Design an enzyme around this catalytic site. Sequence first.
Site, PDB file in Angstrom:
ATOM      1  N   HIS B  41      41.887 -22.211 -27.895  1.00  0.00           N
ATOM      2  CA  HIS B  41      40.812 -22.778 -28.714  1.00  0.00           C
ATOM      3  C   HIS B  41      40.788 -22.225 -30.138  1.00  0.00           C
ATOM      4  CE1 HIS B  41      38.011 -19.523 -27.159  1.00  0.00           C
ATOM      5  NE2 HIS B  41      37.741 -19.468 -28.464  1.00  0.00           N
ATOM      6  N   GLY B 143      33.490 -14.507 -32.160  1.00  0.00           N
ATOM      7  CA  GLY B 143      34.620 -13.783 -32.723  1.00  0.00           C
ATOM      8  C   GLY B 143      35.263 -12.823 -31.726  1.00  0.00           C
ATOM      9  N   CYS B 145      36.429 -13.621 -28.793  1.00  0.00           N
ATOM     10  CA  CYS B 145      37.418 -14.309 -27.985  1.00  0.00           C
ATOM     11  C   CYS B 145      38.805 -13.799 -28.263  1.00  0.00           C
ATOM     12  CB  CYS B 145      37.302 -15.820 -28.122  1.00  0.00           C
ATOM     13  SG  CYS B 145      35.883 -16.505 -27.233  1.00  0.00           S
TER      14      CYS B 145
HETATM   15  C1  LIG Z   1      34.326 -15.880 -27.712  1.00  0.00           C
HETATM   16  C2  LIG Z   1      34.210 -16.574 -29.057  1.00  0.00           C
HETATM   17  O1  LIG Z   1      34.677 -16.059 -30.062  1.00  0.00           O
HETATM   18  N1  LIG Z   1      33.592 -17.777 -29.083  1.00  0.00           N
HETATM   19  C3  LIG Z   1      33.485 -18.641 -30.268  1.00  0.00           C
HETATM   20  C4  LIG Z   1      34.223 -19.967 -30.023  1.00  0.00           C
HETATM   21  N2  LIG Z   1      33.750 -20.628 -28.780  1.00  0.00           N
HETATM   22  C5  LIG Z   1      34.488 -21.880 -28.538  1.00  0.00           C
HETATM   23  C6  LIG Z   1      34.488 -22.350 -27.100  1.00  0.00           C
HETATM   24  C7  LIG Z   1      35.658 -22.278 -26.339  1.00  0.00           C
HETATM   25  C8  LIG Z   1      35.665 -22.596 -24.989  1.00  0.00           C
HETATM   26  C9  LIG Z   1      34.500 -22.989 -24.350  1.00  0.00           C
HETATM   27  C10 LIG Z   1      33.310 -23.076 -25.073  1.00  0.00           C
HETATM   28  C11 LIG Z   1      31.944 -23.373 -24.724  1.00  0.00           C
HETATM   29  C12 LIG Z   1      31.432 -23.641 -23.338  1.00  0.00           C
HETATM   30  C13 LIG Z   1      29.942 -23.907 -23.285  1.00  0.00           C
HETATM   31  N3  LIG Z   1      29.158 -22.731 -23.634  1.00  0.00           N
HETATM   32  C14 LIG Z   1      27.983 -22.814 -24.261  1.00  0.00           C
HETATM   33  C15 LIG Z   1      27.316 -21.508 -24.598  1.00  0.00           C
HETATM   34  O2  LIG Z   1      27.484 -23.898 -24.555  1.00  0.00           O
HETATM   35  C16 LIG Z   1      31.223 -23.275 -25.880  1.00  0.00           C
HETATM   36  N4  LIG Z   1      32.037 -22.915 -26.922  1.00  0.00           N
HETATM   37  C17 LIG Z   1      33.321 -22.777 -26.451  1.00  0.00           C
HETATM   38  C18 LIG Z   1      33.860 -19.699 -27.628  1.00  0.00           C
HETATM   39  C19 LIG Z   1      33.059 -18.441 -27.889  1.00  0.00           C
END
Ligand SMILES: *CC(=O)N1CCN(Cc2cccc3c(CCNC(C)=O)c[nH]c23)CC1
Lengths: 304, 304
Positions: B41, B143, B145
């Site tokens: 992602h 951030g 991830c």
């Molecule tokens: C961990 C981090 O840096 N993040 C920022 C980017 N986000 C993108 C992402 C990727 C995969 C799945 C996601 C979801 C699932 C639903 N969750 C919510 C809280 O609605 C949301 N954003 C996602 C990940 C986190």
Amino acid sequence: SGFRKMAFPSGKVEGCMVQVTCGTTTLNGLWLDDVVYCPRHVICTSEDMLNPNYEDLLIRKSNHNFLVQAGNVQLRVIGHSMQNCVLKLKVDTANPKTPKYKFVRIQPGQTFSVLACYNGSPSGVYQCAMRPNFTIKGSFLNGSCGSVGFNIDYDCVSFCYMHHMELPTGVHAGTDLEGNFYGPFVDRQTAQAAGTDTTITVNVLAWLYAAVINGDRWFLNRFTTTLNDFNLVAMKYNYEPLTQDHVDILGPLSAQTGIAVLDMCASLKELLQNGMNGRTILGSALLEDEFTPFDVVRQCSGVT
Amino acid sequence: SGFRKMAFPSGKVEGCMVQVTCGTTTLNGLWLDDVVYCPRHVICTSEDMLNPNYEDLLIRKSNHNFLVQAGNVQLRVIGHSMQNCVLKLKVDTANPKTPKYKFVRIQPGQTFSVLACYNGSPSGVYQCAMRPNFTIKGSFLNGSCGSVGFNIDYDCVSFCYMHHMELPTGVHAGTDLEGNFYGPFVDRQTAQAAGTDTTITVNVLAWLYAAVINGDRWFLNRFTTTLNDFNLVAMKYNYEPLTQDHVDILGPLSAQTGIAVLDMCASLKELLQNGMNGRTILGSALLEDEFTPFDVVRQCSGVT
Ligand SMILES: *CC(=O)N1CCN(Cc2cccc3c(CCNC(C)=O)c[nH]c23)CC1
Ligand SMILES: *CC(=O)N1CCN(Cc2cccc3c(CCNC(C)=O)c[nH]c23)CC1
């Protein structure tokens, strides 16, 4: 989101750990520049530990009696000296992995990470608080002495603790990196009274602010209190009295959440008087006091 | 003595952390040998996150679009590929700090340390368990991830986890280092059901053995039970059923303390049915399940 008892990354400190052996006693040393710091009781045997005369015991030792091994390489000891309860062994090689560092004496209520070590090898890392009674509730087995506590500000390691002993009660005592003990403790195998411990009130309030930020809000109420009123309750429950300095340190968390510090004190007051009725806050069934307001902000903002 | 939620020393993993930027998205990568591993992602924007077609999004990217920075030095990307939910960026330089390592897929109930990172910089370390429902209850902000979970056996790092997402419930989901998610989770911003979580029974029993070793014995009783009887109680309280494999793993702790596993089950049975009456075990007011029998033995024996 989420809230954990997080320790600093230990890499910078792992690169400083060495094994110090004197006679039959082995413990950990901290190698910074051309000096290795370790507990002075490395020069004792169990025969000496009940009532050691450190000055006399150190006089029977020469530089060649202190064996310092950094992993698999032997360091050449060219000087030795005792400062308070630590020995400083001057070696002929500066540690190439010495980070930027400071020696700091932390205040009771402050937190730090501990890198527990055995035979100069790091085994694990955990976050501690220096108790108001100057003990720490760590995890240390025989051979862990010389393991250090520290904080890390960007690239700078502030060493604040070196482990020296376990009290008969199972709590831990040690020194700053100048060898001065925290608390009334002496490095002698004798009965030693740790004072009455108290709960670090400003840290419990900081952790309640972390709980609100992370979603756990059940404990918030429609009440407020005063510092005087709150402190009557703090005394009954063996909490540290809250001062305006503590309110001021909680200012940023109060501003971020919009919950006035005395309103959070009234939530804390009700939790103390009523318990938690079988509920949890941030996965804990008790009031946590090992997160400072600085730790909460760092963990909730993302500082590296 | 003393018992703490101890993480592995993170040094070996800190030396592998890099920042990966693709377009406007920045996250963490893991640099091992000449490959950087990161969540796929990294190629999405918020515009794509609701329903991404990763194959199509990756096709619009070239090696020069992936910016990899190890602290202050830029890595030259010479290949890119997607494996499940991870991207593998081949770089022209092998990481000089690559430890001995393995990629392992951990089992639910097992524990690991997490080195939370932001912009390729390590911020803190904590110990987690992979929940029976394949989520982890971590501490991760935007951030984070690409931050990884791991275990360390002497000199070998077994990477078991890479962080990818936070569920709307605040719990965390991620993959093994081959990019396969733990659990039913998909890397898409959508409503996702984490299954019913259960308490890791063998770990609670292991932690009760750690409590006995460290002095906390109030919970020991004059009773015993059977696996069948114990499991009737385990089901009522949403604990994992205990099997003979779990009894066998608890064998060493049972031998060290002399408390038969089913006798410890009868103490656990009474704690489940009666609560803790306001008492604590190893500083906790609830039954802790994030220490495996292996963790307890390591922490109580001194393994580095
Ligand atoms: C961990 C981090 O840096 N993040 C920022 C980017 N986000 C993108 C992402 C990727 C995969 C799945 C996601 C979801 C699932 C639903 N969750 C919510 C809280 O609605 C949301 N954003 C996602 C990940 C986190
Ligand atoms: C930490 C470690 O490796 N230890 C082994 C050597 N021990 C020697 C020592 C030093 C200072 C004070 C000591 C006491 C105080 C009384 N404590 C108890 C439990 O009786 C005992 N041994 C001491 C320190 C631990």
